[PDB]
Amino acid sequence: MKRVVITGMGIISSIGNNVEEVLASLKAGKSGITASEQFKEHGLRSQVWGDLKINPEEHIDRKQMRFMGDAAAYAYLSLEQAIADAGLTPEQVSNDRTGIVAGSGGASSENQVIAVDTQREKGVKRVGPYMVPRTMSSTVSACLATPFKIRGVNYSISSACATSAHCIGNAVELIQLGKQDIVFAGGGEELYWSQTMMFDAMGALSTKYNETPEKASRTYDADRDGFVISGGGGMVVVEELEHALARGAKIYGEIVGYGATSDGYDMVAPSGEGAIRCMKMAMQGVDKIDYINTHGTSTPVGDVKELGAIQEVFGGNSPAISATKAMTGHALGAAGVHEAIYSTLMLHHGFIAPSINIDTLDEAAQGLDIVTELREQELTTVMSNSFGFGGTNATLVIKKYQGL
Amino acid sequence: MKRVVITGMGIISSIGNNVEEVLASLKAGKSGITASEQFKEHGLRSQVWGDLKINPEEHIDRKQMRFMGDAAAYAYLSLEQAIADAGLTPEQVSNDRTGIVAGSGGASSENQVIAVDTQREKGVKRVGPYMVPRTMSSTVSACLATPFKIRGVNYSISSACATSAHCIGNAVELIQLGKQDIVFAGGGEELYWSQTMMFDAMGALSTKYNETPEKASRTYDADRDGFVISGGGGMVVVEELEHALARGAKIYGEIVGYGATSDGYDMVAPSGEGAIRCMKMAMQGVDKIDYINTHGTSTPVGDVKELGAIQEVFGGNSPAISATKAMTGHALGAAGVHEAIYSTLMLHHGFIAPSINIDTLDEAAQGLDIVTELREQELTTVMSNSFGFGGTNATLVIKKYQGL
C-alpha cells in the first residue's frame, strides 16, 4: 500500500500568522487568548476569544475575496504558505493528480446575518451576487479550488471539531487508493459573535475568567468551565511518498495511522468508548507513541472521558500528553489541522509544548504524564485526537520519516 | 478490489415521499413544482419551488427532532426508509463496520435566522441549547448517527450541488479500502426563504414562469431562465457485494464508477473540461453507457457546457439523455442522491423518464438523443452527473447486477 507524507504546512491561528510565529508561541507556552469587545457588545456571557491577529482582506485580491468569508480567507492564506513551504511547481499545484479536501465546522454565520439584514432593510437586489459561495458548507474547498486552479478532487468534509482531521485522513485514503498524488488538506473557521452565541446559548463556553482572559482556557485544571472559542486556517500538503522523494521534497513526517469512528451515544457528550476504538485503529501496526496532543477543550466531562480512553488504550507509562487548546482556544473546523501542524512542528523541531494553566490537576489525570513545562527532546511518533459533536472521532498518527 | 452494491433506498423529494411515489412520478413525467407563497411574501423574484409534501414532526419524535433542521429531518426519514428497504435490524445498523457519510449544501439558514432574531430581542439565555447541531455543516451526519447508534465512520461531505454524489462516492471508497461493510450515504436540504434569497440575489433562479409553476423548470428548452429550487432528503445503503450476497440481500445495482474532479476555472459557471475528465474517470471499463441523467438545472450556460462535454466524451455515439430536474427542481445538497435513486429506479424497472417542458430544443442538443417521452426498455448501465459551484464535479455509474 502507498505511503503518505506531509511535505508543506501553512497556518493562521491565535498563536501565529505563519509557522515561524506559531513555533515561537508553542515553545514559550504563550496564550493566544484575549478579551473580546465584540462579544461584550452583543451581550454574550463568554467574553474571551483566540482571535486571529491578521486582516485577510489586506492580503487577498478582491477577485478572490469577493467570494469568501473569513473561513475561506484564512484557509487561502494557509494554502499559499503551504505551497511555498513545499516547494511545489505551478504544474504540480494545477494537475489532474492534485486535489483539495478542506472544510469548516460552520461556514459563514457572519455573511448569513449580513445578507438577511440587508435583504430585510434594502431588498434582494442589494444583497449582491456573492453570498452563496460565502455561506455554503463547501466554502473553504470551493473558494480555494478555483483560484489555485485545482483539477483533482475538490470537496469539503465537515464533522464539527473533527472537521479538518477527517479532511487529512480522507486525503491519506485518496492517496492510498491511487486516486491522487497530492492532496491539499485542512480547514478554516471564522470567528464572529453569531456563531459564538449559539455555543454560549448551550453553556459550552468559558464565562468565569473574562477579567483574566489568558487563564480561561485551562484543560485538565479542576476549575475549568468550558472552552474558549477561536478560529483561523490551516493547510497541509499530503503527498505520496515516492512522488515526494523523486522531487526532493521536504518531509516533515509520515502519516502512519488514521482512525475514524462514531460513539453512537450522545449528541454533545463523548462516550469514551468511541475514542478508544479510534485511537486503536490509528495505532494498528504502530510500534510506540511518544506524545499525544489531546482534543482537550477545557470542558468538565470531555477532558475526563478522553483521559480515561487514553489510560485504557495505553495502560501504564503512557505517552507524554499536552492540550495545546489551553494556549490557543478551540479553532472548531480548523482545530484538527492546527493540532496536526502543532504536533508535526513538535515532531520536526524536537520539543513538547506545555499544557498551560493547570493550577490543580484533575484526579482523572492520575498516572498520566501531563506535560506542564517545555520539554526538549527527539520525538519519533506523535498522535493527535479530535472529537466532535454528534459523537464523531478522528485520530492521526505521524511518524518521522528516516529513509526507511 | 471489492465490489459495491446498492441494497436499500429512501427518499423525500418534490415528486414523492418514498420510492413508490417517486417511481410513479418519474414514469408519468409529473412535475413536483408549485407556487411558493413564502417566497412571494419575502419579496423574492422567483416564486416557485419543488416543495416537500410532508410533515416531518408527525414522523420524528421530539427527542430526535430537537437537534434537527429540515435537512437532517428529511435525511432521517430517508434513512428509516432505506434501512427498511435493505431489511436491516438495529444489530447491522449499529455495528463497528457500519457507517454514515451524508451532508448538505447549506445546513440550516432558517435556524440561524431564528437564533439571531431571538438573541437580539430576548437575549442569549432565551436562545436555548439546540442551535449548534441544527446549524453546523455536519448536521445531517450528526443528527442521524446519534439516534441510529452508528459506530463506524460518521461525517458529512459538502460540495454544493455535488454534495450527496460525493457522499456516495466516498462510501464506495470506504468499502473498497476494507474499512466498512455498509455505509449509509446521502444528503438533505432544507427549503427556506433565506437560503433561496441568496440564489435569487445572484440571478440563478427562474422568475418568468411564476404564473405557471410546472413550466418553470425546462432544461434544454430555448426559453429556460434559471433553476427552480428544491430540497429534501435521500439515502442509499451502500454495501460490500459478498456481504450483500451472504445475507441474501436484494441488489438494485452495482456502483461500478465514481468520478470526482475540479474545473479550476470559474466559481459559478462550469468549464466543460472538468466534466469530461469526471465522466471518463467514472467510466471504469464499462461496455456502454445506456442512459445519462444530466446535472441539467435549466440554466442558459450550464445546460450547454454539459452537452458539449457529453459530445467530447462519447463522440457521435451518445447515450439517451434526460434531465429529471425539469420535473423535480434542484434539490441542492440532496440532488446527487435523489438522482442516483431516480437513475437506479430507471435501471431496475427498465424505463427512461422524460425530459419535460421542451417546447423548443436548444441548438446545442442537435444530434443528441434527448428523451422527451417515457421510454420503456432494458438498461444495463446508467450515469448520473452532478456539478457544483466552485467547479466541483461528481459522476456515478451504476450497472445492473445479474449474478456475475
CSV table of all heavy atoms in Angstrom, one decimal, chain B residues 282-305, unseen atoms left out:
chain,number,residue,atom,x,y,z
B,282,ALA,N,-15.2,8.1,-14.1
B,282,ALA,CA,-16.3,7.2,-13.7
B,282,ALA,C,-16.5,6.0,-14.7
B,282,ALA,O,-17.1,5.0,-14.4
B,282,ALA,CB,-17.6,7.9,-13.6
B,283,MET,N,-16.1,6.2,-15.9
B,283,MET,CA,-16.3,5.1,-16.9
B,283,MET,C,-15.2,4.0,-16.6
B,283,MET,O,-14.3,3.9,-17.4
B,283,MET,CB,-16.5,5.7,-18.3
B,283,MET,CG,-17.7,6.5,-18.5
B,283,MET,SD,-17.6,7.7,-19.8
B,283,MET,CE,-17.7,6.6,-21.2
B,284,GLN,N,-15.3,3.3,-15.5
B,284,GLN,CA,-14.3,2.2,-15.1
B,284,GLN,C,-14.6,1.0,-16.0
B,284,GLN,O,-15.3,0.1,-15.6
B,284,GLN,CB,-14.4,1.8,-13.6
B,285,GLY,N,-14.1,1.1,-17.2
B,285,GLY,CA,-14.1,0.0,-18.1
B,285,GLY,C,-15.4,-0.5,-18.7
B,285,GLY,O,-15.5,-1.5,-19.4
B,286,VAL,N,-16.5,0.3,-18.5
B,286,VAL,CA,-17.9,-0.2,-18.8
B,286,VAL,C,-18.0,-0.4,-20.4
B,286,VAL,O,-17.4,0.3,-21.1
B,286,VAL,CB,-19.0,0.8,-18.2
B,286,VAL,CG1,-18.9,0.9,-16.7
B,286,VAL,CG2,-19.0,2.2,-18.9
B,287,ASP,N,-18.8,-1.4,-20.8
B,287,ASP,CA,-19.1,-1.6,-22.2
B,287,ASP,C,-19.7,-0.4,-22.9
B,287,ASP,O,-19.3,0.0,-23.9
B,287,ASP,CB,-20.0,-2.8,-22.4
B,287,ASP,CG,-19.3,-4.2,-22.2
B,287,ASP,OD1,-18.0,-4.2,-22.0
B,287,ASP,OD2,-20.0,-5.2,-22.3
B,288,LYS,N,-20.8,0.0,-22.3
B,288,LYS,CA,-21.7,1.1,-22.9
B,288,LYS,C,-22.5,1.8,-21.9
B,288,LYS,O,-23.1,1.1,-21.1
B,288,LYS,CB,-22.6,0.5,-24.0
B,289,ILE,N,-22.5,3.1,-21.9
B,289,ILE,CA,-23.5,3.8,-21.0
B,289,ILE,C,-24.8,3.8,-21.8
B,289,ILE,O,-24.8,4.3,-22.9
B,289,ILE,CB,-23.0,5.2,-20.8
B,289,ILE,CG1,-21.7,5.2,-20.0
B,289,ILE,CG2,-24.1,6.0,-20.0
B,289,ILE,CD1,-21.7,4.4,-18.7
B,290,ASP,N,-25.9,3.4,-21.2
B,290,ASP,CA,-27.2,3.4,-21.9
B,290,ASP,C,-28.0,4.7,-21.7
B,290,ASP,O,-28.8,5.1,-22.6
B,290,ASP,CB,-28.0,2.2,-21.4
B,290,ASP,CG,-27.3,0.8,-21.7
B,290,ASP,OD1,-26.8,0.7,-22.9
B,290,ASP,OD2,-27.2,-0.1,-20.9
B,291,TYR,N,-27.7,5.4,-20.6
B,291,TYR,CA,-28.6,6.5,-20.2
B,291,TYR,C,-27.8,7.4,-19.3
B,291,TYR,O,-27.0,6.9,-18.4
B,291,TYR,CB,-29.9,6.0,-19.6
B,291,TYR,CG,-30.6,7.1,-18.8
B,291,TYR,CD1,-31.2,8.2,-19.5
B,291,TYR,CD2,-30.5,7.2,-17.4
B,291,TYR,CE1,-31.8,9.2,-18.8
B,291,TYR,CE2,-31.1,8.2,-16.7
B,291,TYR,CZ,-31.8,9.2,-17.4
B,291,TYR,OH,-32.3,10.3,-16.7
B,292,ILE,N,-27.9,8.7,-19.6
B,292,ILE,CA,-27.3,9.7,-18.7
B,292,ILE,C,-28.4,10.6,-18.1
B,292,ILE,O,-29.1,11.3,-18.8
B,292,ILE,CB,-26.3,10.6,-19.4
B,292,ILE,CG1,-25.2,9.8,-20.0
B,292,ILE,CG2,-25.7,11.6,-18.5
B,292,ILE,CD1,-24.4,10.5,-21.1
B,293,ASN,N,-28.4,10.6,-16.8
B,293,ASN,CA,-29.2,11.6,-16.0
B,293,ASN,C,-28.3,12.8,-15.8
B,293,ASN,O,-27.4,12.7,-15.0
B,293,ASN,CB,-29.7,11.0,-14.7
B,293,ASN,CG,-30.7,11.9,-14.0
B,293,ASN,OD1,-30.3,12.9,-13.4
B,293,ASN,ND2,-31.9,11.5,-14.0
B,294,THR,N,-28.6,13.9,-16.5
B,294,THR,CA,-27.7,15.0,-16.6
B,294,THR,C,-27.9,15.9,-15.4
B,294,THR,O,-28.9,15.9,-14.7
B,294,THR,CB,-27.9,15.9,-17.8
B,294,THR,OG1,-29.3,16.2,-18.0
B,294,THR,CG2,-27.4,15.2,-19.1
B,295,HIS,N,-26.8,16.7,-15.1
B,295,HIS,CA,-27.0,17.7,-14.0
B,295,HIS,C,-28.1,18.7,-14.3
B,295,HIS,O,-29.0,19.0,-13.5
B,295,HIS,CB,-25.6,18.4,-13.9
B,295,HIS,CG,-25.6,19.6,-12.9
B,295,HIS,ND1,-25.9,19.4,-11.6
B,295,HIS,CD2,-25.4,20.9,-13.1
B,295,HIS,CE1,-25.8,20.6,-11.0
B,295,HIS,NE2,-25.5,21.5,-11.9
B,296,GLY,N,-28.1,19.2,-15.6
B,296,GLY,CA,-29.2,19.8,-16.3
B,296,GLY,C,-30.2,20.7,-15.4
B,296,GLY,O,-31.3,20.3,-15.2
B,297,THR,N,-29.7,21.8,-15.0
B,297,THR,CA,-30.5,22.6,-14.0
B,297,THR,C,-31.6,23.5,-14.6
B,297,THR,O,-32.3,24.1,-13.8
B,297,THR,CB,-29.6,23.4,-13.0
B,297,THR,OG1,-28.9,24.3,-13.8
B,297,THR,CG2,-28.6,22.5,-12.3
B,298,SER,N,-31.6,23.7,-15.9
B,298,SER,CA,-32.4,24.7,-16.6
B,298,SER,C,-31.8,26.1,-16.6
B,298,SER,O,-32.5,27.1,-16.6
B,298,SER,CB,-33.9,24.7,-16.0
B,298,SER,OG,-34.8,25.2,-17.0
B,299,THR,N,-30.5,26.2,-16.7
B,299,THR,CA,-29.7,27.5,-16.8
B,299,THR,C,-29.2,27.6,-18.3
B,299,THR,O,-28.9,26.6,-18.9
B,299,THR,CB,-28.5,27.6,-15.9
B,299,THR,OG1,-27.5,26.6,-16.3
B,299,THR,CG2,-28.9,27.3,-14.4
B,300,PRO,N,-29.1,28.8,-18.8
B,300,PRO,CA,-28.6,29.0,-20.2
B,300,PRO,C,-27.2,28.4,-20.5
B,300,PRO,O,-27.1,27.6,-21.4
B,300,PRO,CB,-28.7,30.6,-20.4
B,300,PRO,CG,-29.7,31.0,-19.4
B,300,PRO,CD,-29.6,30.1,-18.2
B,301,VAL,N,-26.2,28.8,-19.7
B,301,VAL,CA,-24.8,28.3,-19.9
B,301,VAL,C,-24.7,26.9,-19.5
B,301,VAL,O,-24.1,26.1,-20.3
B,301,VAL,CB,-23.8,29.2,-19.1
B,301,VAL,CG1,-22.4,28.6,-19.0
B,301,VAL,CG2,-23.8,30.6,-19.8
B,302,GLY,N,-25.1,26.5,-18.2
B,302,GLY,CA,-24.9,25.2,-17.7
B,302,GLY,C,-25.3,24.1,-18.6
B,302,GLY,O,-24.6,23.1,-18.8
B,303,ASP,N,-26.5,24.1,-19.1
B,303,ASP,CA,-27.1,23.1,-19.9
B,303,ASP,C,-26.2,22.8,-21.1
B,303,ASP,O,-25.9,21.6,-21.4
B,303,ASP,CB,-28.5,23.4,-20.4
B,303,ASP,CG,-29.6,23.4,-19.2
B,303,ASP,OD1,-29.2,23.4,-18.0
B,303,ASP,OD2,-30.8,23.5,-19.6
B,304,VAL,N,-25.7,23.8,-21.7
B,304,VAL,CA,-24.9,23.7,-22.9
B,304,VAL,C,-23.5,23.2,-22.7
B,304,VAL,O,-23.0,22.4,-23.5
B,304,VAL,CB,-24.8,25.1,-23.6
B,304,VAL,CG1,-23.7,25.2,-24.7
B,304,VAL,CG2,-26.1,25.5,-24.1
B,305,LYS,N,-22.8,23.6,-21.6
B,305,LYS,CA,-21.5,23.1,-21.3
B,305,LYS,C,-21.5,21.6,-21.1
B,305,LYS,O,-20.7,20.9,-21.6
B,305,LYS,CB,-20.9,23.8,-20.1
B,305,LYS,CG,-20.5,25.2,-20.3
B,305,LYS,CD,-19.4,25.4,-21.3
B,305,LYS,CE,-18.9,26.8,-21.2
B,305,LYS,NZ,-18.1,27.1,-22.4
